[PDB]
């Protein structure tokens, strides 16, 4: 039962990574995703590559190298896997999204630097819905942009501010089965939840260190029933919320030891309830 599984979280099952550029090592990893068969997909940002591991954290494959050509990355941030196994990458310093097939073969790129519709200023988090639409946190444009799976522009929402529907440096994003778009609104210390049309539905949290409060939240994820997972980076902890936004559980504290964190980025959830966390400053992914 998911509630009971989540209330038990505290002790890490295993970890993977460590600083370096060999396969299985990371240098400042950021985004994280779960792929088919509970694969662990890591945006290994300073190595300009994606690494894919099996559900035990064993290296399987990688793709990407530094550059601005097709299938080349420059400090990628977010990564997602869609319903047909394609990899969707937010290619941060190239201000574009790339779509690769389930084998890691480049299919298409869309976007360039700017403020027009379909242009980005530092795309960060990326996710997809059941129909394959792509949702991008366009960080320095303080907005979410929505695309068809081929990169065609669909729509956008959000602008600068701390008011309702406004965003300040949003980083990560998730979309629920109920078609709610969950955005970590980092510099407002809150999660903002929108409908897919862009209307604000609710806010979770606010600035602080008590249960249900955040400092500079980063990764967000949602499970199949709507439980919400937040990498509360400034408080060096993961928080879990019931689907209605109420606080359920927190675990983690500052450090480099087991079940401790120093600089959280992406978060993801396996089909069995294992929570995956990217601890950028310790160059590792921990599984709980």
Please compute the radius of gyration using only Cα atoms.
Answer: 17 Å
- Termini, distance in Å? 16 Å
Order of adjacent strands in the largest pleated sheet? 1-30-29-28
Percent of residues in helices comes to under 10%
Q: Approximately what portion of the residues adopt beta-strand conformation?
A: over 45%
Overall body shape: globular
Query: Do you know the CATH topology?
Result: Neuraminidase
Number of helices: 1
Give the tally of β-strands: 30
PDB class: protein binding
Keywords: protein-protein interaction, beta-propeller, limb girdle muscular dystrophy type 2H, protein binding
Assembly: monomeric
Entry title: 1.3 A Resolution Structure of the of the NHL Repeat Region of D. melanogaster Thin
């Amino acid at each position: 039962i998911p509630k009971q599984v989540y209330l038990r979280k505290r002790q890490q099952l295993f970890q993977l990574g460590g600083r370096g550029s060999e396969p299985g090592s990371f240098t400042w990893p950021r985004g994280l995703a779960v792929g088919p068969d509970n694969s662990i997909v890591v945006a290994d940002s300073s190595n300009h590559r994606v690494q894919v591991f099996d559900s035990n954290g064993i290296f399987v494959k990688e793709f990407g190298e530094y550059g601005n050509g097709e299938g080349e990355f420059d400090c990628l941030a977010g990564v997602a896997v869609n319903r047909i196994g394609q990899y969707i990458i937010a290619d941060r310093y190239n201000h574009r999204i790339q779509v690769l097939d389930p084998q890691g073969r480049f299919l298409r790129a869309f976007g360039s630097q700017g403020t027009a519709d379909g242009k980005f200023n530092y795309p960060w988090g990326v996710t997809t819905d059941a129909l394959g639409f792509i949702y991008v946190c366009d960080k320095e444009n303080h907005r979410v942009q929505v695309f068809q799976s081929d990169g065609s522009f669909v729509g956008k929402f959000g602008s600068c501010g701390r008011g309702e529907g406004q965003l300040e440096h949003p980083h990560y994003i998730a979309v629920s089965n109920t078609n709610r778009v969950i955005v970590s609104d980092s510099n407002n210390h809150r999660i903002q939840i929108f409908d897919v049309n862009g209307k604000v539905l609710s806010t979770v949290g606010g600035e602080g260190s008590d249960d249900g409060q955040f400092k500079f939240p980063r990764g967000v994820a949602v499970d199949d029933q709507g439980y919400i997972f937040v990498a509360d980076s400034g408080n060096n902890r993961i928080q879990i919320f019931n689907p209605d936004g109420s606080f359920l559980k927190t675990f983690g504290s500052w450090g480099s030891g087991d079940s401790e964190f120093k600089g959280l980025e992406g978060v993801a959830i396996m089909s069995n309830g294992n929570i995956l966390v990217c601890d950028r400053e310790n160059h590792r992914v921990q599984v709980f």
